[PDB]
Amino acid sequence: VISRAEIYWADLGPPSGSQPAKRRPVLVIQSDPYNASRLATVIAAVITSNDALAAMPGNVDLPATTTRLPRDSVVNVTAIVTLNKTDLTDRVGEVPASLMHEVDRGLRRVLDL
């Protein structure tokens, strides 16, 4: 069972330029009706320890004490990936509603929505 705003570890694939890659935490941003459906995949935003040299308006600071990640991290709202559900076995934690609202504002900015 995968839910929006949950954080998982995921393989993002081999490196290719600045494409998301390697094993990283990811934040599920796909909505729960799709998460509960027969759809094989989930959309997520990539989390990094910081966004040094990739600092975008809309990026969101995630305190370690709020997410259960080992360190303070950042949601990179311009780094979006689609992953297989069956590959999301490694559950880390979650982002609370108040902070997820900031993530949503960032995504709306990035996608002109």
Add this chain to the structure above:
Amino acid sequence: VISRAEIYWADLRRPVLVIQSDPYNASRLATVIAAVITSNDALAAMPGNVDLPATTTRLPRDSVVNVTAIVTLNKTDLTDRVGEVPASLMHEVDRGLRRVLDL
């Protein structure tokens, strides 16, 4: 110069629809977010997906914007421009994205 609603051929070979907004497209950001286009007619039946009749885009076949297939690509890998998705259909794409992402 990459703009929202443009269709490009991309190595994932598939057509992709730029959904990243133009301030980010014009910035030094190295990447662009896109929705994957497919010519599998069955996917027209998935809620949120947007049907693109061949005559509405310059693609060779009837296609579908798959709003659940989102990729982030290097800008420099978007060289092969097809055209644009017209405003009317882009509004449907936006609605689909809002549904899929709870936005």
Add this chain to the structure above:
DNA sequence: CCC
């Protein structure tokens, strides 16, 4: 330049 899907099946």
